[PDB]
Design a protein around this nucleic acid. Sequence first.
DNA 1: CGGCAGTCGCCGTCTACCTCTCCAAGAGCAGCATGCGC
DNA 2: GCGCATGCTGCTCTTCTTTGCCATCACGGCGACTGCCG
RNA 3: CCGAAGCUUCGGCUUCGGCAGGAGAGGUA
Lengths: 49, 49, 1104, 97, 146, 97, 98
Amino acid sequence: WLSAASFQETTRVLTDAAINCRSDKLNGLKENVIIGKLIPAGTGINRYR
Amino acid sequence: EFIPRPVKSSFREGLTVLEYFINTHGARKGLADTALRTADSGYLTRRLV
Amino acid sequence: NSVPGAPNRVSFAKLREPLEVPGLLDVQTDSFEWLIGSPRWRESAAERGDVNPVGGLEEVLYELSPIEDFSGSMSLSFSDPRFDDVKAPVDECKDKDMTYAAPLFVTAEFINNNTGEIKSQTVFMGDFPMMTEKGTFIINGTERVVVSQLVRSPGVYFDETIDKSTDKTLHSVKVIPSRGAWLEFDVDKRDTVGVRIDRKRRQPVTVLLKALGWTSEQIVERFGFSEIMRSTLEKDNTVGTDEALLDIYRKLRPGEPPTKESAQTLLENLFFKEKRYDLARVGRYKVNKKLGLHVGEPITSSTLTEEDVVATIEYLVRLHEGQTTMTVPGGVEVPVETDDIDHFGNRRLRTVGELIQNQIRVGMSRMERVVRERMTTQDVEAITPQTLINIRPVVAAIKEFFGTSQLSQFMDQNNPLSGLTHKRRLSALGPGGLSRERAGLEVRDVHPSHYGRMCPIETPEGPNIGLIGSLSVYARVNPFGFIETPYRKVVDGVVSDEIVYLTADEEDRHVVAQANSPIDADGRFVEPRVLVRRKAGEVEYVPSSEVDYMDVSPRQMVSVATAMIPFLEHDDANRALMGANMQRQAVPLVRSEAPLVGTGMELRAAIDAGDVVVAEESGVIEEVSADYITVMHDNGTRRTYRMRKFARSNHGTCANQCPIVDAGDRVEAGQVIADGPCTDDGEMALGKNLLVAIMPWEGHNYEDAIILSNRLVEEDVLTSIHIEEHEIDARDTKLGAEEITRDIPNISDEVLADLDERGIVRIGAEVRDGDILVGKVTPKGAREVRDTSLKVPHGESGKVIGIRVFSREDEDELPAGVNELVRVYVAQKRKISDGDKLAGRHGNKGVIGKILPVEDMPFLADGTPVDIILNTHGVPRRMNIGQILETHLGWCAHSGWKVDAAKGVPDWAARLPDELLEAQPNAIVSTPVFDGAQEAELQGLLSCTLPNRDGDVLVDADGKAMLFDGRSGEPFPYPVTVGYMYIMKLHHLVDDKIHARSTGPYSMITQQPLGGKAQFGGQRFGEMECWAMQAYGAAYTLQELLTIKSDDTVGRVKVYEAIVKGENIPEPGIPESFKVLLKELQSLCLNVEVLSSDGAAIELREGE
Amino acid sequence: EVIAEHPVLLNRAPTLHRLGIQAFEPMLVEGKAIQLHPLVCEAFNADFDGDQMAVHLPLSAEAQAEARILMLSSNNILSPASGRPLAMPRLDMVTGL
Amino acid sequence: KRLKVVAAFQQSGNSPMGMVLDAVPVIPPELRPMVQLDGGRFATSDLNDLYRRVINRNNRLKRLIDLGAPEIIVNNEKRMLQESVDALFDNGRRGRPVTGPGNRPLKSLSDLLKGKQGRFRQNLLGKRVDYSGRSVIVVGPQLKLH
Amino acid sequence: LDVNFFDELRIGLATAEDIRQWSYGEVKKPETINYRTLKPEKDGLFCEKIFGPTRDWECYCGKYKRVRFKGIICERCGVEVTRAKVRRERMGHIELA
Amino acid sequence: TGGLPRVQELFEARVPRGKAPIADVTGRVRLEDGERFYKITIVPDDGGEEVVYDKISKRQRLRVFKHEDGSERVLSDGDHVEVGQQLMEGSADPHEVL
DNA sequence: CGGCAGTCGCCGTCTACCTCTCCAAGAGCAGCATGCGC
DNA sequence: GCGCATGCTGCTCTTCTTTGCCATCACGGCGACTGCCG
RNA sequence: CCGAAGCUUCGGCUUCGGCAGGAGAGGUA
Ligand SMILES: [Mg+2]
Ligand SMILES: [Zn+2]
């Protein structure tokens, strides 16, 4: 819901997520940018870090 | 559409009043598209990313 | 010419002019003259069509009254507006931050029908802002301009659309009112005519005819031929007027039972009323001109009638048929066709008078509602006109219009041309027009009806392209709001000299010839066939025997700024657009000089702007100094004119006036007495003449850059003064009150030498960035005072040229609470440097790339360096070849020429005048915009120019010269183009655009850096800039850019300490904006939590 | 010697692709304008009639290493969408050659 | 269409009774600041008025209920309180917007999350930064590619 | 806090019990701020008791004004003696009738 | 600016305005030229069922396709086709071709 | 019951930067302070 | 000399939506829905 | 966080003083 709420239609996605009790695993570029972590690409992946 | 009457004078000899007036319909279209098509282009980019 | 004292500028024109351009500011002043009701407009209206000299305020005051109550026992009326004298002059209003206004009084009478007595007395209705002699308003000390608005006219508008399935042509009418309902008849795809009263589904139209009072007999008589009308009739089955009435009330009254009297009250309180529908005079006219009803009769009675409805339906069904002519019983024959909604015969102009009258009407209506409601709660025999009238709504409406409004705009005073152009602008936006998003692509096009009324070239370049335009030089406005343009009447194939003004709706029934048409000595056309303009803007080549009208001049279709570009017909439209837009951004320079090549419009564009001083009468000059001129008239009266020395304009430039007369001259009325900001001997001069070469040079002029010489810096050729203003206050705080004094405890005596024994700097002190201008200590009622001293904002300097202190102890109008307001001024002489923007009149534009020593510059055979170098790669691909012709003509004018006529005039000089066959060095010429110098004439003049001091001709017959190389010494292998060109300095200087920041102020909610250059802000790292970082693969740069440089509150300080101490940068934490987002989501009753790998939600609040 | 071998990042808006951000090595000049190499104007799409650009400063060791290795202008010559060279002679250089 | 909603309230461990409110949260004060307008007064906060409206209506309802009022008046007050809360959470969705000074519609709690000028696309995906500058670019032909 | 320990982000509907849980007190008076004393009102929308002290290590009265008395609740005012940054993270609630 | 709309109607996949019926089976074709609407019926040469493509507007020019012999000509009643063959001129539906 | 077609509401419409002005007030409810009358 | 009346002045809200005011708002895509006809 | 003033053993300690939101218009690439 974090990646879809910042694209379009915030109210609808937030309402559906609230009803369904969804969980976000924070495993994308946008979510890691939003919360302030290293993106999983380039030099931020486990082999190079 | 194309106006039947052509512009037979070059810019080295100078257009007349009527030719200059009918020539202004194609320099405004390009300038409105420069400031309107870029909206669709931006939207497309953002949706593709 | 036509000006008493003017420079002798010889002209290349071959055509004569039968008309002179009108006053260039009469579009602003005429409307206010009509609104005020002054005798000047009364006489002008008495000149032609003297029927109803009704002012602007008088018609509102007469439409309002009488005001009656529900019982019908008393009434109130108004009459006789009149104005007093203006309280304070213009300069006082601009100085003390006041408004330029005059009180307004009206007379009101109160009649009591029960008794019969009358009580009348004079009431006061507030101060009315007034317009100065230049067409501007001074509101709270700032100059303002009200801009005219382009709106649709109130009338009938038939259209036509096709379907997608059957693809048949369905029509749709639309009676648009001025303020009221919205009838909208239409036809459909089957065969049913339907009305949609007040936007509510649909219905049959026979029900509406029945509801008006029509029956089967009359209906089926008026609607014969039309099979659609028969089908429409036989479907409703409404057996009686009652049926129709009840149905109307049923549909238009939801959640209510349909009544009979209420239906006959609705369909009476909707259209045929007087306070619920009001087709104004434009409406009545434009409805009586299409349908063709009552001609000859006036335009009184402005409410709809059954007649119009009927004629409308007639029109619609006959257009569905095909009948190309229609006659309504009792009228004229009118053609039947569809109409365009963007024709300048349907679009009208709402000037300043009709923009102020609307607000006055709104305030009047509010006051009328208040008095009507209060007339029934007071006791009789104690009711007087002064106790029934409230002034507050009217003054509130006036001050809301003249302040926070989209059409009363801040005036731009970069130079006289921009100020003149601002007052001639037609804007299509505003409260009643369009929107930047709703407007499409068909309202931003050059309609064929703009010829002579709007300029097709001068328009903005951004999102307002086509929504803002400029009026043409010869255009003028109807008493209704329709723009006119002049023509010359022709009879029997000979052009006369009688001028008739025609609107765009009347010139489509005549054949109009072209200005550039060969005319013999008697006035007969030479060419067998002429180029004309037919009905629908169709250009054709008809044999010359049908012409009915003719143009007045070739420059009839251009505005006042486009008519100042020489060789305009050789330029593309886009480049002329940029040249016209960039002529309004030039800055005034310390010394001015007139163009070598001009157009002739520059003389009357400076007198009409109003930034010069002209003499109002004839006399001899008595005394001349640097700041006043005294003129003794012939009768005996003496008049003295003062000057504005080093005044600050709206944009920070300098406005300086200088006298150009001697101590014994004879002066004629209208002669220019003093110069102005951008004026040279009475004519506008925005730039300087420089010697040019067109060639590449080592890549320093790569991609639109410019190379300058050092002689332009050592001789102050391009230098401008800029003045800036600052201010401080002394508003009594809670404990005690602030008091400006030299005593600033916490500061020493070093940074106190300037401040005199009062606390203010001394006129003449040079300030830097950090200097204290005026020092103030806010106390507590010492060891409680603060350091609150006015300082010079970062990156600003210059000498203090003046102060202005206002105090209430000497009796002055200061905002309550404040006790001291000082205003300091600082001026800085700015030179030219790298990064500054230059321009020409043809679209040339670039920033200065390099400034070279005078010994490093290419030089002619006699050792003359060139002043500017331009690249040759940008000319051919942009189609602005007027600049090369301008350089050729400028060289010819500078050097001077002489044509030999020993064996008669040469063949190429047959059509030249007799005064252009010889010229002196440093001559001034003029080439009009569409009738000027041909190219055979230029080619012949380039081989006649005079030599220099030594008998040498530097530029050969092609306009090319051989230059030497100033760095290596060898001559360049090929000849290069040399000449003179007119270069202006634009108001985009690099000293106002440089910015940098390490740390500074931060925001409050989301602790990110502030924004803007005045607040020492940071630069946005937007969304598109993150995609590039993620595509590069840089995972650490992005994290550092987003956490420890923007939001990580605890990491910012540790990062700064680590950098200063030389240690390693720490690991980023968590941004604060995320926590703000979480509290935002939690405030909408959403249970959002941050979990760990095994549940057990983290607190996420620190504190430990 | 403070600004010796310390790269900076230059950006011009709009940033339509990757090459809208590049890392250079600063030099001190006299004036108030930034000097740009003639061969990066194709990637930046920047003429010289009034454009403006922004500067950013890397701080840590990882950011400096990324700027010096991944983003240097002399390492990004080929276009990433078609493989054609972008830093090529054009306009005046083509006529001279 | 209905099963998508009826099954969400069954598969998880939530309840359908969270759609009816009995207490309303209040945002922390430092997220809706009120500051002086240049030594004068305070000029609106766009969020401290919708709270005042809710509190006023709730107080009037409490006083009227604990007095023995007739049913019609209590129903009117309850409807008005419902409308005020609806305007607090989403202004303009139903009926007409609640305006302030100058006929300018007020901005609700859900207007700080939506649009291109909301929190998500203007504060979380792009920010303002330190150590940055700006100027006009000019051509230098003596430089190298780096 | 460490960002390297987050693993999930759960959202869901909130009940009245949760709303009464998060809150530190209930607001009753529509008052906003005291114009004369320039101090927050009582039981208003800016009250110091519900939300937190306006100044560092201070309270409504003047019994505690130092940094060594933190953690003690004022017995005549009710205001905690702690930092003023707690006004960005403490909420309240309104009890509907 | 005339190309962009089709790059949208392609990516953001909708049903193309100017649709063109495609063939499902394989064999000869029919064509019931009426007034403004052909009705191509197709003749499955495998022995199945003729799919009566109805309301095939007359405006659309018939697909100029190389017929089985080799005649690059419009789809004429009596022309063998196969699975996928476009029957009219225009952009095919990305959801039918799947 | 069963199709059915108009209709009505909600979603979206490129990035970065600069300059200026303007942002509820009168009515009403007490709370006295001094002048005037008996 | 005391009581009553009327004007400076603190002092804290208050600002709707009928039979009124108000005037409108592009253009395309999508999905429910809802009265309406059979 | 910055400034002023004291003790200062040179790590630092103490007193006082201090803030930044919206709407509209025009413009450059
Ligand atoms: Mg450019
Ligand atoms: Zn206390």
